[PDB]
Amino acid sequence: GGDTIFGKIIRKEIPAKIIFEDDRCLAFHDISPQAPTHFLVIPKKHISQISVAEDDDESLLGHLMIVGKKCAADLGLNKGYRMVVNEGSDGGQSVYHVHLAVLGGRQMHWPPG
Amino acid sequence: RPGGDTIFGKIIRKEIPAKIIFEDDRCLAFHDISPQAPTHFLVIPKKHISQISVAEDDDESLLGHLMIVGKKCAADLGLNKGYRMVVNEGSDGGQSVYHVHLAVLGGRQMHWPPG
Ligand SMILES: Nc1ncnc2c1ncn2[C@@H]1O[C@H](COP(=O)(O)OP(=O)(O)OP(=O)(O)OP(=O)(O)OC[C@H]2O[C@@H](n3cnc4c(N)ncnc43)[C@H](O)[C@@H]2O)[C@@H](O)[C@H]1O
C-alpha cells in the first residue's frame, strides 16, 4: 500500500482519528486542520497522484467523493463544505498518495488558495 | 430539460456560449469566466445534480469521471507543474450555481489553506 505516511495510517502502523473505513478507502481527520472540520478520504490502493489515475479507477475516485459526502453529513456540515484534491508542486500536494480533503464548519473563501 | 435550469444547463444545450475544452455523453469541460488562476476551468455532469450533498450512490462512476476528465484536460492544457481540484458545496463551500461542478485551477502556485 505504499511508502508514505498515509500508507502507514492505512496499515494501522501509526494512529489517526478514523471516521470511516471500508474495503477500499479510509477517512480520517487531518493532523493539520485548516477548518473546524477538516478530514481526508484516501483510497487503499496507492495512487500517487491524480494525474496518474487510470481509467479503471474511475468509480473508485467517485467512491471517495461519495464517502466524503456521507462523512460530511455525519459530522454535521449542513451549511456546506469544500472538497479539494491537490496535484503536484503548484497544487500544493503534501503527500504523494491521492487524498480528497473535505473542509467545513466555517465560511470557505475565494480564491481557494 | 437535459442539463437542468441553471446557466450550466443552458451551456450544455448550447443556448449560451462557452469556451469548451472537452465534451462527451456524460460531462462537459469549459473555461471559467472569472478565472482565479492563469488556467481555471470547470467539469460538470450533463445530468443535473444540484450539489454534491444530494448525489446518489449510483452517481459514483459519474463523479469519478469528472475527476478523470479534469486530470486529462489539465494535462492537455499543459499544467505539468500541478493544479488544484475544488468542489464547492453549499453556502459555506462558496457554491453559487446549484449544478455540481469540479473546478481545476493551475498555472501558478496554489496556497494553503484552500480558502
Ligand atoms: N457562463 C459562465 N461560464 C463559465 N463560467 C461561469 C459562468 N458563470 C459562472 N461561472 C463560474 O462558475 C464557477 C462556480 O460558480 P459559483 O461560484 O457557484 O457562482 P458565481 O458565478 O461565482 O456567482 P457569485 O459568486 O458572484 O454570487 P453573487 O455575487 O452574484 O450573489 C451572491 C449570492 O446571492 C444570491 N442571490 C442572487 N440574487 C439574489 C437575490 N435577489 N436575493 C437573495 N440572494 C440572491 C446568489 O445566488 C449568490 O449566491 C465560478 O467561478 C464562475 O466564475
Author numbering:
A (entry chain A): 14 to 126
B (entry chain B): 12 to 126
Paper text:
The HINT1 protein is a compact and symmetric dimer, with two adenosine pockets at opposite sides. Here we report that Ap4A specifically polymerizes HINT1 into (HINT1-Ap4A)n (HAn) filaments in solution and in the activated RBL cells.
The complex structures of HINT1H114A with Ap4A were then obtained through both co-crystallization (HINT1H114A-Ap4Acocrystallization, 0.95 Å) and soaking methods (HINT1H114A-Ap4Asoaking, 1.42 Å). The complete Ap4A molecule was observed in one adenosine pocket of a HINT dimer (denoted as HINT1 Dimer I) in both co-crystallization and soaking structures. The other adenosine pocket of the same HINT1 dimer is vacant of Ap4A, because it is blocked by the crystal packing. In both structures, one adenosine (A1) and the α-phosphate (Pα) of Ap4A bind inside the pocket, whereas the rest of the molecule adopts a unique Sticking-out conformation above the HINT1 surface. Interestingly, the Ap4A-complexed structure closely resembled the HINT1 apo structure with an overall RMSD about 0.238 Å. Only three positions including the residues S107, I32, and D16 surrounding the adenosine pocket had minor shifts of 1.3, 3.8, and 1.9 Å upon Ap4A binding. Of note, the sticking-out portion of Ap4A, containing the second adenosine (A2) and the delta phosphate (Pδ), fit into an adjacent HINT1 dimer in the crystal structure (denoted as HINT1 Dimer II).
